[PDB]
Each structure stands twice: as C-alpha cells, then as structure tokens.
Short mmCIF file of all heavy atoms in Angstrom, two decimals:
data_model
loop_
_atom_site.label_atom_id
_atom_site.label_comp_id
_atom_site.label_asym_id
_atom_site.label_seq_id
_atom_site.Cartn_x
_atom_site.Cartn_y
_atom_site.Cartn_z
N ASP O 185 48.06 168.24 77.92
CA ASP O 185 48.52 167.23 77.00
C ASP O 185 47.94 165.89 77.44
O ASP O 185 47.72 165.03 76.65
CB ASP O 185 50.05 167.18 76.93
CG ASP O 185 50.61 167.72 75.62
OD1 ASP O 185 49.84 168.19 74.79
OD2 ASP O 185 51.84 167.70 75.42
N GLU O 186 47.70 165.76 78.71
CA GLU O 186 47.14 164.53 79.26
C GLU O 186 45.64 164.47 78.96
O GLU O 186 45.11 163.41 78.63
CB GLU O 186 47.41 164.44 80.76
CG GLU O 186 46.20 164.06 81.62
CD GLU O 186 46.55 163.97 83.09
OE1 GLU O 186 46.82 165.02 83.71
OE2 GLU O 186 46.54 162.85 83.63
N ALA O 187 44.97 165.61 79.08
CA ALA O 187 43.55 165.71 78.77
C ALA O 187 43.32 165.46 77.29
O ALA O 187 42.33 164.83 76.90
CB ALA O 187 43.01 167.08 79.17
N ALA O 188 44.23 165.97 76.46
CA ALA O 188 44.15 165.79 75.02
C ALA O 188 44.25 164.31 74.65
O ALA O 188 43.44 163.80 73.89
CB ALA O 188 45.24 166.60 74.32
N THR O 189 45.26 163.65 75.21
CA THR O 189 45.44 162.21 75.05
C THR O 189 44.18 161.47 75.48
O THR O 189 43.72 160.55 74.79
CB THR O 189 46.63 161.69 75.89
OG1 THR O 189 47.84 162.33 75.47
CG2 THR O 189 46.79 160.19 75.73
N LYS O 190 43.63 161.87 76.63
CA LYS O 190 42.45 161.23 77.19
C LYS O 190 41.18 161.42 76.34
O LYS O 190 40.34 160.53 76.27
CB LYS O 190 42.20 161.69 78.63
CG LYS O 190 43.17 161.07 79.63
CD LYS O 190 42.89 161.52 81.06
CE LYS O 190 44.00 161.07 81.99
NZ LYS O 190 43.76 161.44 83.41
N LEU O 191 41.05 162.58 75.71
CA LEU O 191 39.95 162.81 74.78
C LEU O 191 40.01 161.83 73.61
O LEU O 191 38.99 161.30 73.16
CB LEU O 191 39.97 164.26 74.26
CG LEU O 191 39.40 165.32 75.22
CD1 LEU O 191 39.64 166.71 74.67
CD2 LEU O 191 37.92 165.08 75.45
N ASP O 192 41.22 161.58 73.12
CA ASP O 192 41.39 160.63 72.03
C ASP O 192 41.20 159.19 72.49
O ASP O 192 40.62 158.37 71.78
CB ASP O 192 42.73 160.85 71.33
CG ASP O 192 42.66 161.96 70.29
OD1 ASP O 192 41.70 161.95 69.48
OD2 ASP O 192 43.53 162.85 70.27
N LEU O 193 41.67 158.88 73.70
CA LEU O 193 41.46 157.55 74.27
C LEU O 193 39.97 157.30 74.45
O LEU O 193 39.48 156.22 74.13
CB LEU O 193 42.19 157.38 75.61
CG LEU O 193 43.71 157.19 75.53
CD1 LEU O 193 44.31 157.15 76.93
CD2 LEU O 193 44.07 155.94 74.75
N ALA O 194 39.26 158.30 74.95
CA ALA O 194 37.82 158.20 75.14
C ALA O 194 37.12 157.86 73.83
O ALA O 194 36.24 157.01 73.80
CB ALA O 194 37.26 159.48 75.73
N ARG O 195 37.52 158.53 72.75
CA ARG O 195 36.96 158.25 71.43
C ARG O 195 37.20 156.80 71.00
O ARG O 195 36.32 156.17 70.42
CB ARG O 195 37.54 159.22 70.39
CG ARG O 195 37.08 160.65 70.57
CD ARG O 195 37.70 161.57 69.53
NE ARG O 195 37.29 162.97 69.72
CZ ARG O 195 36.17 163.49 69.23
NH1 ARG O 195 35.33 162.75 68.52
NH2 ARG O 195 35.89 164.77 69.46
N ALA O 196 38.39 156.29 71.30
CA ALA O 196 38.72 154.89 71.00
C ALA O 196 37.81 153.92 71.76
O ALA O 196 37.41 152.89 71.23
CB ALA O 196 40.18 154.60 71.31
N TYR O 197 37.50 154.25 73.01
CA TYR O 197 36.61 153.42 73.82
C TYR O 197 35.20 153.44 73.23
O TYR O 197 34.55 152.40 73.12
CB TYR O 197 36.61 153.86 75.29
CG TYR O 197 37.74 153.27 76.12
CD1 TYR O 197 38.92 153.97 76.32
CD2 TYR O 197 37.62 152.01 76.70
CE1 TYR O 197 39.95 153.43 77.07
CE2 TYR O 197 38.64 151.47 77.46
CZ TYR O 197 39.80 152.18 77.64
OH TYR O 197 40.83 151.65 78.39
N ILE O 198 34.75 154.62 72.83
CA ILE O 198 33.47 154.78 72.13
C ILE O 198 33.40 153.99 70.82
O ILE O 198 32.39 153.35 70.52
CB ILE O 198 33.18 156.27 71.85
CG1 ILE O 198 33.00 157.03 73.17
CG2 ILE O 198 31.95 156.44 70.96
CD1 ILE O 198 32.84 158.52 72.99
N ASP O 199 34.48 154.05 70.03
CA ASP O 199 34.56 153.30 68.77
C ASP O 199 34.44 151.81 69.01
O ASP O 199 34.10 151.05 68.11
CB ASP O 199 35.92 153.51 68.10
CG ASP O 199 36.12 154.91 67.59
OD1 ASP O 199 35.14 155.65 67.38
OD2 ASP O 199 37.30 155.27 67.37
N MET O 200 34.76 151.39 70.22
CA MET O 200 34.84 149.98 70.58
C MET O 200 33.59 149.54 71.34
O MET O 200 33.45 148.37 71.70
CB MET O 200 36.07 149.79 71.45
CG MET O 200 36.61 148.38 71.52
SD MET O 200 37.85 148.28 73.00
CE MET O 200 36.60 147.81 74.42
N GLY O 201 32.70 150.49 71.61
CA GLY O 201 31.46 150.21 72.31
C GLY O 201 31.60 150.05 73.81
O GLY O 201 30.68 149.56 74.47
N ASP O 202 32.74 150.46 74.36
CA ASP O 202 32.93 150.46 75.81
C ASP O 202 32.61 151.85 76.35
O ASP O 202 33.50 152.66 76.61
CB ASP O 202 34.35 150.04 76.17
CG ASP O 202 34.56 149.90 77.67
OD1 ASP O 202 33.59 150.03 78.43
OD2 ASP O 202 35.72 149.66 78.09
N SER O 203 31.32 152.12 76.50
CA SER O 203 30.86 153.42 76.95
C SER O 203 31.25 153.69 78.40
O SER O 203 31.50 154.83 78.79
CB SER O 203 29.34 153.54 76.77
OG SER O 203 28.68 152.52 77.50
N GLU O 204 31.31 152.63 79.20
CA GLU O 204 31.71 152.75 80.60
C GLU O 204 33.18 153.16 80.71
O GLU O 204 33.54 154.04 81.50
CB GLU O 204 31.46 151.45 81.36
N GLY O 205 34.02 152.51 79.91
CA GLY O 205 35.42 152.87 79.83
C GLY O 205 35.61 154.28 79.31
O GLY O 205 36.46 155.03 79.80
N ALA O 206 34.81 154.66 78.32
CA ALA O 206 34.86 156.01 77.78
C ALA O 206 34.46 157.03 78.84
O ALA O 206 35.12 158.05 79.02
CB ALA O 206 33.97 156.14 76.55
N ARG O 207 33.37 156.75 79.52
CA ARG O 207 32.85 157.64 80.53
C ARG O 207 33.85 157.92 81.67
O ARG O 207 34.04 159.04 82.04
CB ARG O 207 31.52 157.14 81.10
CG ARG O 207 31.02 157.99 82.22
CD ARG O 207 29.83 157.41 82.93
NE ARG O 207 29.38 158.20 84.07
CZ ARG O 207 29.79 158.01 85.33
NH1 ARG O 207 30.68 157.08 85.60
NH2 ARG O 207 29.31 158.75 86.31
N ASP O 208 34.48 156.88 82.17
CA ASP O 208 35.46 157.03 83.24
C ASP O 208 36.59 157.96 82.84
O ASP O 208 37.02 158.80 83.64
CB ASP O 208 36.01 155.67 83.67
CG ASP O 208 34.97 154.81 84.35
OD1 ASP O 208 33.85 155.29 84.59
OD2 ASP O 208 35.29 153.64 84.66
N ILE O 209 37.07 157.82 81.61
CA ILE O 209 38.14 158.67 81.11
C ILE O 209 37.66 160.11 80.89
O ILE O 209 38.37 161.06 81.18
CB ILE O 209 38.72 158.10 79.80
CG1 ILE O 209 39.46 156.79 80.08
CG2 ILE O 209 39.67 159.09 79.16
CD1 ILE O 209 40.25 156.28 78.90
N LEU O 210 36.44 160.25 80.39
CA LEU O 210 35.86 161.57 80.16
C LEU O 210 35.70 162.35 81.46
O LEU O 210 35.91 163.56 81.49
CB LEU O 210 34.52 161.44 79.43
CG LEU O 210 34.66 161.03 77.96
CD1 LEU O 210 33.30 160.73 77.36
CD2 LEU O 210 35.36 162.13 77.18
N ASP O 211 35.35 161.65 82.53
CA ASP O 211 35.21 162.26 83.85
C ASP O 211 36.53 162.84 84.33
O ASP O 211 36.56 163.84 85.05
CB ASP O 211 34.67 161.26 84.86
CG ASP O 211 33.23 160.86 84.57
OD1 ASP O 211 32.53 161.66 83.91
OD2 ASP O 211 32.82 159.77 85.00
N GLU O 212 37.63 162.20 83.95
CA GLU O 212 38.95 162.70 84.29
C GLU O 212 39.22 164.00 83.53
O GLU O 212 39.78 164.94 84.08
CB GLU O 212 40.03 161.66 83.98
CG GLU O 212 39.95 160.46 84.91
CD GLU O 212 40.73 159.26 84.41
OE1 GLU O 212 41.63 159.44 83.56
OE2 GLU O 212 40.42 158.14 84.86
N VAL O 213 38.79 164.04 82.27
CA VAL O 213 38.93 165.25 81.47
C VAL O 213 38.13 166.41 82.07
O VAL O 213 38.60 167.55 82.07
CB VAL O 213 38.51 165.02 80.00
CG1 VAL O 213 38.74 166.28 79.18
CG2 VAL O 213 39.31 163.86 79.40
N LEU O 214 36.93 166.12 82.58
CA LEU O 214 36.11 167.14 83.23
C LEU O 214 36.87 167.83 84.36
O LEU O 214 36.71 169.02 84.60
CB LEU O 214 34.81 166.54 83.79
CG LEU O 214 33.72 166.11 82.81
CD1 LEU O 214 32.49 165.64 83.57
CD2 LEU O 214 33.37 167.26 81.87
N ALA O 215 37.69 167.05 85.07
CA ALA O 215 38.46 167.58 86.19
C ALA O 215 39.78 168.21 85.74
O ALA O 215 40.25 169.16 86.36
CB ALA O 215 38.72 166.48 87.21
N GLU O 216 40.35 167.69 84.66
CA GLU O 216 41.72 168.02 84.27
C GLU O 216 41.85 169.00 83.11
O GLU O 216 42.78 169.80 83.07
CB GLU O 216 42.50 166.75 83.92
CG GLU O 216 42.68 165.78 85.07
CD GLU O 216 42.94 164.36 84.59
OE1 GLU O 216 43.31 164.19 83.41
OE2 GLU O 216 42.77 163.42 85.39
N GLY O 217 40.93 168.92 82.15
CA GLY O 217 41.07 169.69 80.92
C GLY O 217 40.83 171.18 81.07
O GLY O 217 40.26 171.64 82.06
N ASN O 218 41.26 171.94 80.07
CA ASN O 218 40.92 173.36 79.99
C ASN O 218 39.47 173.51 79.57
O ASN O 218 38.78 172.51 79.37
CB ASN O 218 41.86 174.11 79.03
CG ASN O 218 41.83 173.55 77.61
OD1 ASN O 218 40.82 173.03 77.13
ND2 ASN O 218 42.96 173.66 76.92
N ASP O 219 39.03 174.75 79.40
CA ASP O 219 37.63 175.02 79.07
C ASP O 219 37.19 174.33 77.79
O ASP O 219 36.08 173.81 77.71
CB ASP O 219 37.37 176.53 79.00
CG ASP O 219 37.53 177.21 80.35
OD1 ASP O 219 37.59 176.50 81.38
OD2 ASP O 219 37.59 178.46 80.38
N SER O 220 38.05 174.31 76.80
CA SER O 220 37.72 173.67 75.55
C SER O 220 37.61 172.16 75.66
O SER O 220 36.73 171.57 75.13
CB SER O 220 38.75 174.02 74.49
OG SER O 220 38.32 173.53 73.26
N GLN O 221 38.55 171.57 76.35
CA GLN O 221 38.57 170.13 76.54
C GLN O 221 37.42 169.67 77.42
O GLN O 221 36.86 168.59 77.22
CB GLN O 221 39.91 169.70 77.15
CG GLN O 221 41.10 169.94 76.23
CD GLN O 221 42.42 169.78 76.94
OE1 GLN O 221 42.56 170.17 78.10
NE2 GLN O 221 43.39 169.19 76.26
N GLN O 222 37.06 170.49 78.40
CA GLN O 222 35.90 170.22 79.24
C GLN O 222 34.64 170.21 78.38
O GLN O 222 33.82 169.30 78.49
CB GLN O 222 35.79 171.25 80.36
CG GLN O 222 36.80 171.02 81.49
CD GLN O 222 36.97 172.24 82.38
OE1 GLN O 222 36.82 173.38 81.94
NE2 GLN O 222 37.30 172.00 83.65
#
C-alpha cells in the first residue's frame, strides 16, 4: 500500500518536472514494491 502510494507520488513529481524527486521515490519502490510495482 506504501509502494502503491509512492508510485502515484512519483507520477505527481514527474507531472511537476521534478525528475530527481520522482527518481528518489521510485528507488524506494524498487526496494519495497511487489513484482508488478517494481
């Protein structure tokens, strides 16, 4: 549920042009998410 939230947060950062902010959150998903979220 946290990875899911983070996937959506990452999209918001991307929509805003903060790729660095998006990337940092995405890296957390890589560690935390299930196979699909990864």
Side-chain angles (χ1 to χ4, degrees), residues 185-203 205-222:
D185 252 3
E186 133 179 69
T189 299
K190 285 181 189 182
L191 281 173
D192 277 313
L193 285 176
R195 291 179 182 275
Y197 275 95
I198 295 175
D199 292 339
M200 201 194 89
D202 185 5
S203 59
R207 176 188 177 268
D208 292 355
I209 292 189
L210 288 172
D211 292 336
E212 291 164 21
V213 183
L214 288 184
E216 296 158 18
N218 58 31
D219 294 346
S220 187
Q221 295 169 321
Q222 284 163 330

